[PDB]
């Protein structure tokens, strides 16, 4: 299937409490592999997946040097934005940035991204053509003009279409056992009386990877988006994910309901029914 | 690997 590499950066000012807190994390698909925290003692980009620890000292020295430069740039950016928006120096503000690339099943470049948000709202983004900018307002227009004058997009495009994709391929290979695998959901159903005439059927999907999954309840015919509670997919904490869907049904009609599970790790969709 | 060049907004 397709794959992605994404880097997420967050810088938060804290006036009167020192320099802004900077956190960087990197992911390949739904797996985190690196982190940097400006408040930590190590002051190094650190591994968060076993397969990246195989990279040599030059790799780590390089990621650490580069991430420290990102930290200082976004620290300056907080100051610049406070100015562009004529804000006081007393409040805390947030700059977020994300960039990365997607590749298709053939591991060839599919799409690139590079965008920013200020206080949780879109600020500026490189458009899909990787040549033009989408600016949210006058402040962002100032940034856009600055970046056009210094030809930032052309250099970013080269990274997103080349370097980025090359790193993604490298990581997909070195971490092949963990990244190119699929963990099919382990499933089960529970039943609980919620009254003297109704019951709750809950369909579980546990320990699956990647996170993408579809859980649906059907009654004799199809889909039941009525009185069906579906929780947001959540991390189990061990690299896998979980999700459940529940339906409230008239007591005695359990037989009419089936839970359908779709996941890339399953050769064929699962159909589950309540079996006391 | 992250970008090797940085630039201010």
């Amino acid at each position: 299937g397709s794959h992605s590499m994404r880097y997420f950066f967050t810088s938060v000012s804290r006036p009167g409490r020192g320099e802004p807190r900077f956190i960087a994390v990197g992911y390949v698909d739904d797996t985190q592999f690196v982190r940097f925290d400006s408040d930590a003692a190590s002051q190094r980009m650190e591994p968060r997946a076993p397969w990246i620890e195989q990279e040599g000292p030059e790799y780590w020295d390089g990621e650490t040097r580069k991430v420290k430069a990102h930290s200082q740039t976004h620290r300056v950016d907080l100051g610049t934005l406070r100015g562009y928006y004529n804000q006081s120096e007393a409040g805390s503000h947030t700059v977020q940035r994300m960039y990365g690339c997607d590749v298709g099943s053939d591991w060839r470049f599919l799409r690139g991204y590079h965008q920013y948000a200020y206080d949780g709202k879109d600020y500026i983004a490189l458009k899909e053509d990787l040549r033009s900018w989408t600016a949210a307002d006058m402040a962002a227009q100032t940034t856009k003009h600055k970046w056009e004058a210094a030809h930032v997009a052309e250099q970013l495009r080269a990274y997103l279409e080349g370097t980025c994709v090359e790193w993604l391929r490298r990581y997909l290979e070195n971490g092949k056992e963990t990244l190119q695998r699929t963990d099919a959901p382990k499933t089960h159903m529970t039943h609980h009386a919620v009254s003297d005439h109704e019951a709750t059927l809950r369909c579980w999907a546990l320990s699956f990877y990647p996170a993408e999954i579809t859980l649906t309840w059907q009654r004799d015919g199809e889909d039941q988006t009525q009185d069906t509670e579906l929780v947001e997919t959540r991390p189990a904490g061990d690299g896998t994910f979980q999700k459940w869907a529940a339906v409230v049904v008239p007591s005695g009609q359990e037989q009419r309901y089936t839970c359908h599970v779709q996941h890339e790790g399953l050769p064929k969709p699962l159909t589950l029914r309540w079996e006391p | 690997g992250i970008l090797g060049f940085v630039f201010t907004l």
Epitope: A69, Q72, E154 | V6, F7
Partner: T-cell receptor
């Protein structure tokens, strides 16, 4: 990333035309040319960005290859004042400029 | 533009000296190079943004700091038997883009 400049040295008579080359196996997002006199700071002559672009500044003509892997500087009717070290440089992926080793031009009267 | 005062510097071997580089171009990135006679440029150290710096190709024996956007001081310590050279500072609006060079400083260190 590497940038190779040729020829290393060029000596020509005033009035002749000349061409110097800057070549690479890699693609550059932007490229610059400089002229430097001994013991002085290099002077920026031009920046090119678009593949295939041509920029003419007086008697100097600069071209950026379509693939953005090469550039050339051509001078028409060389004057003694053109004597100097010509350097090409390209955008570096680690936040610097990749410099060629230069072409030392001597224009004889 | 870029100022590198003074144009000429003379020091006795074993005496640390700091070369100044100041720019009023409002540039974020700064660079230091050394050049030997009849040769090209060799990158010593650079800084893409205030409060950060990184080594060039020949950083041994040198040190820099970037506490202010407008300045990038180069300290020449007991590098080695070769501190004598022409030193050039340059800046660019953002790192990797076109650089503007200072006039250079000629440093001679004698025994």
């Amino acid at each position: 990333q590497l940038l190779e400049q040729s020829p290393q040295f060029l000596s020509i008579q005033e009035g002749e035309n000349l061409t110097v080359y800057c070549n690479s196996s890699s693609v550059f997002s932007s490229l610059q040319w400089y002229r430097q006199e001994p013991g002085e700071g290099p002077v920026l002559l031009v920046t090119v960005v678009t593949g295939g672009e041509v920029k003419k500044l007086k008697r100097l003509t600069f071209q950026f290859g379509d693939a953005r892997k090469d550039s050339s500087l051509h001078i028409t009717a060389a004057q003694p004042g053109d004597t100097g070290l010509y350097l090409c440089a390209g955008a570096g992926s680690q936040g610097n400029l990749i410099f060629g080793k230069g072409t030392k031009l001597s224009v004889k009267p | 533009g870029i100022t590198q005062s003074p144009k000429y510097l003379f020091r006795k071997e074993g005496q640390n000296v700091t070369l100044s580089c100041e720019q009023n171009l409002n540039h974020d990135a700064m660079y230091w190079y050394r050049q030997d006679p009849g040769q090209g440029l060799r990158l010593i150290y650079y800084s893409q943004i205030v409060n950060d710096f990184q080594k060039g190709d020949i950083a041994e024996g040198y040190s820099v700091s970037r506490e202010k956007k407008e300045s990038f001081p180069l300290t020449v310590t007991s590098a080695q038997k070769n501190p004598t050279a022409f030193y050039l500072c340059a800046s660019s609006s953002r790192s990797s883009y076109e650089q503007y060079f200072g006039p250079g400083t000629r440093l001679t260190v004698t025994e």
